[PDB]
Design a protein around this ligand. Structure first.
Ligand SMILES: [Cl-]
Ligand SMILES: [Cl-]
Length: 186
C-alpha cells in the first residue's frame, strides 16, 4: 500500500535527522586535540614553506591525541621540527609512518558547556523527528480521504508511525547520553 510507502519514507526522514545529529556531534570533542591546532604551522617542504595540513592527513582517534600521517614520510623529521618550533607546548612522537601528539582534555568547565551543546542538538533532532511524524500522519489522513487507504489502515499505519517516532526519540536520547558520558568521563 501507499501506507507502507509513507512509513518507509517517514522512517528514512527520521534516520536522516539522526544522521544530521551525529554529524553535529562529530566536532564536539572533549580534548584539545584538533586539526586547527596546526593552522599556523609551516614546514619548508622542498624549499617551499607549506602548511602541515597540506602535507599530511590529520586525525584525532581519541580525545587526547592528534595523529599526523604525512604524504611523504621522509618529511616527518621536518614536520616535528616545525611543530616544536611552533611551541604550542607539544612533544611529538614518531612511529616512522605517523607523528603523534598528546593533548590534555578540555577543562571540565568547557566540558559542561559542550554537554549543553549536545542537548541543543539533541532537542533540535527530536523536533525534526516530530515534524516527520506530523508530516506522515498528515500524509496518511490524506491518503485515506483520497481513497488509497481504509479507516482500518489509517489507525494501523498511524500507530506504526507513532511507534517509530518513539524509537527515534529514544535513539536520540541514547546518542546524547553516550556523548555526554564520553565527554565528561575523559
Ligand atoms: Cl578524525
Ligand atoms: Cl500529529
Amino acid at each position: 500500500a501507499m501506507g507502507q510507502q509513507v512509513l518507509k519514507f517517514s522512517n528514512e526522514k527520521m534516520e536522516k535527522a539522526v544522521a544530521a545529529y551525529s554529524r553535529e556531534l562529530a566536532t564536539v570533542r572533549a580534548g584539545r586535540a584538533s586539526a586547527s591546532v596546526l593552522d599556523k604551522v609551516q614546514v619548508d617542504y622542498y624549499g617551499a614553506p607549506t602548511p602541515v595540513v597540506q602535507l599530511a592527513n590529520i586525525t584525532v582517534p581519541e580525545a587526547r591525541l592528534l595523529v599526523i600521517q604525512p604524504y611523504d614520510k621522509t618529511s616527518i623529521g621536518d614536520i616535528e621540527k616545525a611543530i616544536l618550533k611552533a611551541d604550542l607546548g607539544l612533544n611529538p612522537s614518531n612511529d616512522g609512518t605517523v607523528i603523534r601528539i598528546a593533548f590534555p582534555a578540555l577543562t571540565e568547565e568547557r566540558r559542561r558547556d559542550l554537554v549543553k551543546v549536545v542537548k541543543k542538538y539533541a532537542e533540535e533532532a527530536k523536533v525534526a523527528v516530530r515534524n516527520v511524524r506530523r508530516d506522515g500522519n498528515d500524509d496518511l489522513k490524506k491518503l485515506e480521504k483520497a481513497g488509497e487507504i481504509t479507516e482500518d489502515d489509517l489507525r494501523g499505519y498511524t500507530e506504526d508511525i507513532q511507534k517509530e517516532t518513539d524509537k527515534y526519540i529514544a535513539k536520540v536520547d541514547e546518542i546524547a547520553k553516550n556523548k555526554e558520558k564520553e565527554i565528561m568521563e575523559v
